[PDB]
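User: Predict structure, ligand MN0.
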Amino acid sequence: GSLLDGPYQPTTFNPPTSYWILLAPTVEGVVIQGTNNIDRWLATILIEPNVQTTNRIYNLFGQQVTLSVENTSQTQWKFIDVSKTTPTGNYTQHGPLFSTPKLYAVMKFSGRIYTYNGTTPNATTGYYSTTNYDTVNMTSFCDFYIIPRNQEEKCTEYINHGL
Ligand SMILES: CO[C@]1(C(=O)O)C[C@H](O)[C@@H](NC(=O)CO)[C@H]([C@H](O)[C@H](O)CO)O1
Ligand code: NA
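Assistant: Predicted complex:
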């Protein structure tokens, strides 16, 4: 794919703005985490199908965090954005994406971190307003690709329909 740079291996990096980071995880757990080290700690976790409400432990920024999660779906995996605004506070859950292809994407743009949400094949975007957004450093725990924003409809197509 001429619009799909990669695959790249799990790494810690400061993504450039206006680029979608297309994530291709395999198992349940932490997909990606990122922070500005001031007032936003954001991660995305992945939940396999058929998970009744339960406490699960996730390794987030080097510590054990217990979260109450669920995936009702039988056919779709669930991405959940988790976010805290202070180093010592609680994570809250936002912008879930129920996904058949098992693909996710994040982007730093216009004061925000954008992710996908909703239900494939009709997924939309949401965002998290982030102080000094372009400073956000990210660790991907899975293989990933890069797509420019000017080709967002293509990133959206990948999110909805897979590679
Ligand atoms: C308070 O405003 C916002 C934000 O502009 O950040 C609005 C945004 O739509 C929302 N996104 C979503 O819920 C999902 O995409 C986001 C979020 O709830 C918080 O940032 C989490 O701390 O809050
Ligand atoms: Na999301």
